[PDB]
Design an enzyme around this catalytic site. Structure first.
Site, PDB file in Angstrom:
ATOM      1  N   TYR A  27     -21.825  16.117  18.324  1.00 29.60           N
ATOM      2  CA  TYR A  27     -23.253  16.237  18.614  1.00 29.60           C
ATOM      3  C   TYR A  27     -23.748  15.617  19.934  1.00 29.60           C
ATOM      4  O   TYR A  27     -24.830  15.949  20.369  1.00 29.60           O
ATOM      5  CB  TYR A  27     -24.077  15.684  17.419  1.00 29.60           C
ATOM      6  CG  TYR A  27     -23.989  16.585  16.222  1.00 29.60           C
ATOM      7  CD1 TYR A  27     -24.797  17.753  16.117  1.00 29.60           C
ATOM      8  CD2 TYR A  27     -22.992  16.382  15.263  1.00 29.60           C
ATOM      9  CE1 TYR A  27     -24.655  18.616  15.033  1.00 29.60           C
ATOM     10  CE2 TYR A  27     -22.889  17.204  14.184  1.00 29.60           C
ATOM     11  CZ  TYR A  27     -23.662  18.387  14.106  1.00 29.60           C
ATOM     12  OH  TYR A  27     -23.560  19.209  13.028  1.00 29.60           O
ATOM     13  N   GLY A  29     -24.336  15.587  23.492  1.00 35.17           N
ATOM     14  CA  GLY A  29     -24.196  16.578  24.526  1.00 35.17           C
ATOM     15  C   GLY A  29     -24.552  17.931  23.982  1.00 35.17           C
ATOM     16  O   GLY A  29     -25.028  18.069  22.908  1.00 35.17           O
ATOM     17  N   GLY A  31     -23.275  20.601  22.555  1.00 34.99           N
ATOM     18  CA  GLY A  31     -22.864  21.196  21.300  1.00 34.99           C
ATOM     19  C   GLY A  31     -23.655  20.784  20.077  1.00 34.99           C
ATOM     20  O   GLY A  31     -24.434  19.869  20.111  1.00 34.99           O
ATOM     21  N   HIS A  47     -30.634  12.311  16.742  1.00 34.17           N
ATOM     22  CA  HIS A  47     -31.425  12.516  17.972  1.00 34.17           C
ATOM     23  C   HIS A  47     -31.706  13.993  18.198  1.00 34.17           C
ATOM     24  O   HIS A  47     -32.828  14.337  18.599  1.00 34.17           O
ATOM     25  CB  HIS A  47     -30.650  11.971  19.185  1.00 34.17           C
ATOM     26  CG  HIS A  47     -31.422  12.057  20.491  1.00 34.17           C
ATOM     27  ND1 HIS A  47     -31.030  12.876  21.503  1.00 34.17           N
ATOM     28  CD2 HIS A  47     -32.518  11.379  20.926  1.00 34.17           C
ATOM     29  CE1 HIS A  47     -31.831  12.693  22.564  1.00 34.17           C
ATOM     30  NE2 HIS A  47     -32.785  11.790  22.211  1.00 34.17           N
ATOM     31  N   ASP A  48     -30.728  14.833  17.906  1.00 31.93           N
ATOM     32  CA  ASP A  48     -30.905  16.301  17.995  1.00 31.93           C
ATOM     33  C   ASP A  48     -31.979  16.704  16.983  1.00 31.93           C
ATOM     34  O   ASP A  48     -32.831  17.505  17.262  1.00 31.93           O
ATOM     35  CB  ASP A  48     -29.598  16.993  17.600  1.00 31.93           C
ATOM     36  CG  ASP A  48     -28.589  17.017  18.748  1.00 31.93           C
ATOM     37  OD1 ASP A  48     -28.960  16.621  19.859  1.00 31.93           O
ATOM     38  OD2 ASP A  48     -27.496  17.505  18.470  1.00 31.93           O
ATOM     39  N   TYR A  51     -35.520  15.668  18.251  1.00 34.05           N
ATOM     40  CA  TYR A  51     -36.044  16.630  19.214  1.00 34.05           C
ATOM     41  C   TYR A  51     -36.435  17.946  18.467  1.00 34.05           C
ATOM     42  O   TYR A  51     -37.301  18.657  18.910  1.00 34.05           O
ATOM     43  CB  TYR A  51     -34.940  16.951  20.205  1.00 34.05           C
ATOM     44  CG  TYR A  51     -34.822  16.010  21.361  1.00 34.05           C
ATOM     45  CD1 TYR A  51     -35.492  14.762  21.406  1.00 34.05           C
ATOM     46  CD2 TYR A  51     -33.947  16.279  22.391  1.00 34.05           C
ATOM     47  CE1 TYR A  51     -35.376  13.926  22.532  1.00 34.05           C
ATOM     48  CE2 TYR A  51     -33.814  15.452  23.472  1.00 34.05           C
ATOM     49  CZ  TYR A  51     -34.469  14.226  23.511  1.00 34.05           C
ATOM     50  OH  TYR A  51     -34.281  13.438  24.616  1.00 34.05           O
ATOM     51  N   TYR A  64     -41.769  10.244  30.131  1.00 33.98           N
ATOM     52  CA  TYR A  64     -42.602   9.272  29.420  1.00 33.98           C
ATOM     53  C   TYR A  64     -42.524   7.926  30.076  1.00 33.98           C
ATOM     54  O   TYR A  64     -41.744   7.700  31.000  1.00 33.98           O
ATOM     55  CB  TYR A  64     -42.198   9.182  27.951  1.00 33.98           C
ATOM     56  CG  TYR A  64     -40.731   8.931  27.744  1.00 33.98           C
ATOM     57  CD1 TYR A  64     -40.185   7.652  27.848  1.00 33.98           C
ATOM     58  CD2 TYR A  64     -39.868   9.978  27.477  1.00 33.98           C
ATOM     59  CE1 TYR A  64     -38.827   7.437  27.672  1.00 33.98           C
ATOM     60  CE2 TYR A  64     -38.487   9.784  27.353  1.00 33.98           C
ATOM     61  CZ  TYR A  64     -37.959   8.533  27.394  1.00 33.98           C
ATOM     62  OH  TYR A  64     -36.602   8.325  27.296  1.00 33.98           O
ATOM     63  N   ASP A  89     -35.850   8.970  21.833  1.00 29.52           N
ATOM     64  CA  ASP A  89     -34.839   8.506  22.790  1.00 29.52           C
ATOM     65  C   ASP A  89     -34.596   6.983  22.558  1.00 29.52           C
ATOM     66  O   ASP A  89     -33.428   6.582  22.596  1.00 29.52           O
ATOM     67  CB  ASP A  89     -35.346   8.698  24.177  1.00 29.52           C
ATOM     68  CG  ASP A  89     -35.206  10.128  24.658  1.00 29.52           C
ATOM     69  OD1 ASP A  89     -34.691  10.978  23.945  1.00 29.52           O
ATOM     70  OD2 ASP A  89     -35.614  10.400  25.787  1.00 29.52           O
TER      71      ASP A  89
END
Length: 121
Positions: A27, A29, A31, A47-48, A51, A64, A89
């Protein structure tokens, strides 16, 4: 934004975002599939997901502002997207920091086809 997130990751962990976290596991990066390899890979998955909670925000480009208080990351008031992006983040950088002890170089450049299993957000 992408460069800000990178700098936050370096500040937290002492590792450069590229290439320590830009092709790690399943995960971290570009992909995304399968079961996360380890805790650090799970940071990226969450984190994916984070978002993905913000379909109409643009975390790569949208800048930000944040500050450090006692070393803690504090996101400063911007637009709703910028506030939400910062919190995703911040979480990831703190997640990477907490899991540096189990970070493994073997999961760098991990191949996509080995990302077996499934996870939902």
């Amino acid at each position: 934004s992408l460069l800000e997130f990178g700098k936050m990751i370096l500040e937290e962990t002492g590792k450069l975002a590229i290439p320590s976290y830009s092709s790690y596991g399943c995960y971290c990066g570009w992909g995304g599939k399968g079961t996360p390899k380890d805790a650090t890979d799970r940071c990226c998955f969450v984190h994916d997901c984070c978002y993905g909670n913000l379909p109409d925000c643009n975390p790569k480009s949208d800048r930000y502002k944040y500050k450090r208080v006692n070393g803690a990351i504090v996101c400063e008031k911007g637009t709703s997207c910028e506030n939400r992006i910062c919190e995703c983040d911040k979480a990831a950088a703190i997640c990477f920091r907490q899991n540096l002890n189990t970070y493994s170089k073997k999961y760098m450049l991990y191949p996509d086809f080995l990302c077996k299993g499934e996870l939902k957000c």
